[PDB]
Amino acid sequence: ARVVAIISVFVILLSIVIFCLETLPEFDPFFLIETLCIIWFTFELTVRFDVMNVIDIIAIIPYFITLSLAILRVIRLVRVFRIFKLSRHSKGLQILGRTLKASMRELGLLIFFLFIGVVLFSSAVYFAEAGSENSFFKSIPDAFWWAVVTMTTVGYGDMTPVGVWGKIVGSLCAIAGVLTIALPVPVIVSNFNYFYHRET
Amino acid sequence: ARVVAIISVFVILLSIVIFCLETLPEFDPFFLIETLCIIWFTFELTVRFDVMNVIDIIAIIPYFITLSLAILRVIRLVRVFRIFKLSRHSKGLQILGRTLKASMRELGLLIFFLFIGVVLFSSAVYFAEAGSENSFFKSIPDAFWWAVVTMTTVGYGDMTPVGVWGKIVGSLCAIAGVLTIALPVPVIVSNFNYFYHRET
Amino acid sequence: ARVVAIISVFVILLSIVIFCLETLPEFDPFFLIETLCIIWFTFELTVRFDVMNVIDIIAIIPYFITLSLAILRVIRLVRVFRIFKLSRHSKGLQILGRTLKASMRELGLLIFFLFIGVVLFSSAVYFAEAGSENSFFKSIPDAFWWAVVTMTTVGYGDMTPVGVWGKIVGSLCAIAGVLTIALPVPVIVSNFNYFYHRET
Amino acid sequence: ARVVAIISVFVILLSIVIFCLETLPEFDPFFLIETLCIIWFTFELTVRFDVMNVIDIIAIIPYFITLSLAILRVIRLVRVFRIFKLSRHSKGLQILGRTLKASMRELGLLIFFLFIGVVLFSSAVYFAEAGSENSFFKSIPDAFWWAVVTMTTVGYGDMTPVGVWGKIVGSLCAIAGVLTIALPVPVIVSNFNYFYHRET
Numbered sequence: 176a177r178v179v180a181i182i183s184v185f186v187i188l189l190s191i192v193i194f195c196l197e198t199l200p201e202f203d204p205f206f207l208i209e210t211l212c213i214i215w216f217t218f219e220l221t222v223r224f225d226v227m228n229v230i231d232i233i234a235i236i237p238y239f240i241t242l243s244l245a246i247l248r249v250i251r252l253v254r255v256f257r258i259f260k261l262s263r264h265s266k267g268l269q270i271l272g273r274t275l276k277a278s279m280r281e282l283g284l285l286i287f288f289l290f291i292g293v294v295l296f297s298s299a300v301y302f303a304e305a306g307s308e309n310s311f312f313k314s315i316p317d318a319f320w321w322a323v324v325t326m327t328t329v330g331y332g333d334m335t336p337v338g339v340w341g342k343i344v345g346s347l348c349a350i351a352g353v354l355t356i357a358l359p360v361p362v363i364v365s366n367f368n369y370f371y372h373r374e375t
Numbered sequence: 376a377r378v379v380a381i382i383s384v385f386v387i388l389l390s391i392v393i394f395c396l397e398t399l400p401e402f403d404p405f406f407l408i409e410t411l412c413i414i415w416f417t418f419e420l421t422v423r424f425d426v427m428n429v430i431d432i433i434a435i436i437p438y439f440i441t442l443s444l445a446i447l448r449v450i451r452l453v454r455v456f457r458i459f460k461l462s463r464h465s466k467g468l469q470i471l472g473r474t475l476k477a478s479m480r481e482l483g484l485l486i487f488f489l490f491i492g493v494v495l496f497s498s499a500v501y502f503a504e505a506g507s508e509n510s511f512f513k514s515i516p517d518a519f520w521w522a523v524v525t526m527t528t529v530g531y532g533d534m535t536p537v538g539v540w541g542k543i544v545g546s547l548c549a550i551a552g553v554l555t556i557a558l559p560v561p562v563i564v565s566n567f568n569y570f571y572h573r574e575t
Numbered sequence: 576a577r578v579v580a581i582i583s584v585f586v587i588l589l590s591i592v593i594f595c596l597e598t599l600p601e602f603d604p605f606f607l608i609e610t611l612c613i614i615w616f617t618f619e620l621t622v623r624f625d626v627m628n629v630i631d632i633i634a635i636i637p638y639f640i641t642l643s644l645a646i647l648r649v650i651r652l653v654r655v656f657r658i659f660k661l662s663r664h665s666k667g668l669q670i671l672g673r674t675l676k677a678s679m680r681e682l683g684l685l686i687f688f689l690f691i692g693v694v695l696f697s698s699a700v701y702f703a704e705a706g707s708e709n710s711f712f713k714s715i716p717d718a719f720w721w722a723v724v725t726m727t728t729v730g731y732g733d734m735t736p737v738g739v740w741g742k743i744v745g746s747l748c749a750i751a752g753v754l755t756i757a758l759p760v761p762v763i764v765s766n767f768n769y770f771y772h773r774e775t
Numbered sequence: 776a777r778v779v780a781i782i783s784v785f786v787i788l789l790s791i792v793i794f795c796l797e798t799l800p801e802f803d804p805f806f807l808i809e810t811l812c813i814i815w816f817t818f819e820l821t822v823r824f825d826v827m828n829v830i831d832i833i834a835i836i837p838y839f840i841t842l843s844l845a846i847l848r849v850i851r852l853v854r855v856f857r858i859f860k861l862s863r864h865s866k867g868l869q870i871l872g873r874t875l876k877a878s879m880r881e882l883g884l885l886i887f888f889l890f891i892g893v894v895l896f897s898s899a900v901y902f903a904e905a906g907s908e909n910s911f912f913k914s915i916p917d918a919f920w921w922a923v924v925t926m927t928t929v930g931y932g933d934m935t936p937v938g939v940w941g942k943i944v945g946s947l948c949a950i951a952g953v954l955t956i957a958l959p960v961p962v963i964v965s966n967f968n969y970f971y972h973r974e975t
């Protein structure tokens with residue numbers, strides 16, 4: 176039983192590695208390993224037969240579909256959901272799932288505050304920069320990325336073609352982003368700590 | 376009474392989308408949608424007749440004004456205050472408003488500490504770099520942006536033309552910024568959590 | 576007695592503005608305003624006659640000295656200590672001073688952990704990159720800045736000439752920096768909140 | 776007994792300085808200082824004779840080995856473990872060691888969540904960008920660094936050759952990284968504060 180669990184974890188990790196390696200530019204030996212991992216996945220699934228069973232289903236749907244290029248890239252992407260098959264073995268990942276399910280309102284509030292701040296500061300920086308020639312931002316949607324990476328403090332990069340009002344707006348954006356990403360997050364963190372210590 | 380609320384939210388979101396799209400470079404169909412959204416806004420306003428009523432007023436003042444380019448960009452910017460019309464429907468946004476109103480002293484203290492740190496580290500880095508040729512910063516105001524994005528950890532970008540003393544000042548700036556943005560923020564976060572859990 | 580306080584705050588702010596503006600490249604009208612601010616500073620000082628009196632002293636020592644270029648830049652820099660004359664009027668800045676005085680051990684521990692992490696990750700990234708040609712870092716001191724801005728999450732900029740081991744070291748540096756800047760800071764924040772709420 | 780401790784701290788600091796300086800491009804006077812520091816290290820070790828004794832051992836193994844270039848760079852790197860000889864004298868560093876030993880599960884959970892987020896967002900951004908010509912990322916491993924520095928908010932640099940879907944994935948990556956680095960860290964911080972206040 177524990178040997179079967181360790182085999183399952185090794186097979187999931189092997190499938191993740193094979194995914195990532197077959198995207199490498201240096202590269203059957205991948206398709207045979209892939210079909211072996213999928214044979215094990217579907218054997219485990221058809222022995223077992225919630226969200227973990229849905230994950231086990233999604234873990235083989237792409238392989239069985241591949242037997243417009245947009246749909247093809249979408250399914251080759253959803254082949255990455257094999258990494259969530261580690262949830263059945265990892266207890267911290269199940270705690271993270273319970274936390275995400277229990278703080279849905281707070282995640283929505285975080286996304287809402289970010290949406291509002293992004294629209295606000297993108298409009299502000301677009302209208303601050305639009306008065307000049309060779310404007311940095313071409314539209315308000317063109318500043319959405321800048322606003323996201325400034326509010327999250329990830330950082331944009333080179334802001335040299337920006338003027339004084341653009342930099343004033345950017346300073347306000349940095350401050351407001353710190354605050355707005357700091358307000359919902361403590362509640363999610365408290366939920367995680369609750370579930371974690373309840374488990375252990 | 377709930378269908379009217381969902382229509383109001385859809386109209387506010389449509390006006391936000393129309394704002395952002397009419398700034399796009401690909402672009403009457405926007406002015407007719409705009410005048411329809413404003414007709415609904417003013418109908419709701421003149422049926423209703425605090426800060427939310429002021430927001431409802433500001434949401435139509437620009438449209439009615441547009442019937443030096445600096446004033447024009449300023450009013451075309453204040454057309455973005457339609458996004459705060461979501462406060463009447465979103466409870467988290469009203470909680471955020473109550474939080475901001477209740478932590479005014481702490482917001483002022485945050486801005487004050489940032490002002491002091493920005494002046495201090497801009498002076499320090501300007502005088503550290505000014506001893507060389509082709510100085511990175513041309514004045515102490517020219518380093519204000521750098522100091523803001525280093526204290527907020529948003530990051531400046533390429534700091535390669537900076538010397539040893541400039542980098543020592545930058546290290547101190549990073550540390551001091553972490554601390555100063557970390558001191559007022561817990562109080563604002565505690566106020567938000569108080570109002571949020573009082574509501575729910 | 577309150578008009579005198581508001582005059583003092585206006586004069587301190589005017590001296591800060593004059594400092595920052597006389598560094599501008601566009602620029603007696605500054606030296607006369609400066610000597611008026613210093614006449615007021617020394618009048619207030621010689622009417623009054625702790626750390627605030629030391630600040631009042633340092634606020635006029637540069638003006639009275641200016642009546643190798645390294646010493647000159649050093650004193651023209653210490654002219655920035657006029658911004659700490661706002662401590663006598665701002666209560667939050669005195670709270671910040673009390674906090675800094677009460678968390679000296681924690682500030683030293685933060686600086687010590689950063690020193691250790693910086694030396695460690697600078698050595699690691701230098702020896703990871705040194706095996707190649709056109710190495711990004713020329714010495715272990717040459718990576719000190721990179722390590723500081725990666726541990727503080729301020730960010731370095733372009734890390735494209737870095738290899739796989741350099742990026743593994745950089746990932747570890749980012750994680751370890753998050754942790755080490757997160758460990759001492761809560762104690763300083765708790766001290767600040769204690770002093771702040773004790774005052775108010 | 777205290778003079779010997781201050782000599783030991785001075786010798787450790789001198790060896791750290793000599794390490795960092797002998798990597799400088801400007802540079803026996805370093806090898807003689809090095810052999811003196813090692814003579815003191817081994818004298819202290821052979822007078823004393825846990826993890827601190829292992830550190831004292833590792834602090835001289837490289838010098839005694841140097842009496843493929845990969846092994847040589849590896850040992851010249853492990854010469855940096857002299858900086859951990861400060862643990863015997865610094866109490867905060869022993870507190871940090873106790874904290875790291877007591878929060879091993881949480882450190883593993885942090886690394887696990889980062890691994891999962893990195894694989895997820897690297898796959899997502901690779902498949903979002905791969906539909907175009909001159910793709911920014913060449914493989915899913917080629918986006919591992921980008922995902923790490925976006926989730927840690929250290930920042931990547933120039934993301935201009937990235938498209939709309941790449942920037943949507945990057946926004947999600949920034950948000951998810953904030954959350955996942957925010958969930959395990961409070962427990963490690965609480966452990967550190969516990970050990971710190973237990974000591975003092």
Ligand SMILES: [K+]
Binds near residue numbers: 329927
């Ligand atoms: K950051």
Ligand SMILES: [K+]
Binds near residue numbers: 728729
């Ligand atoms: K950053």
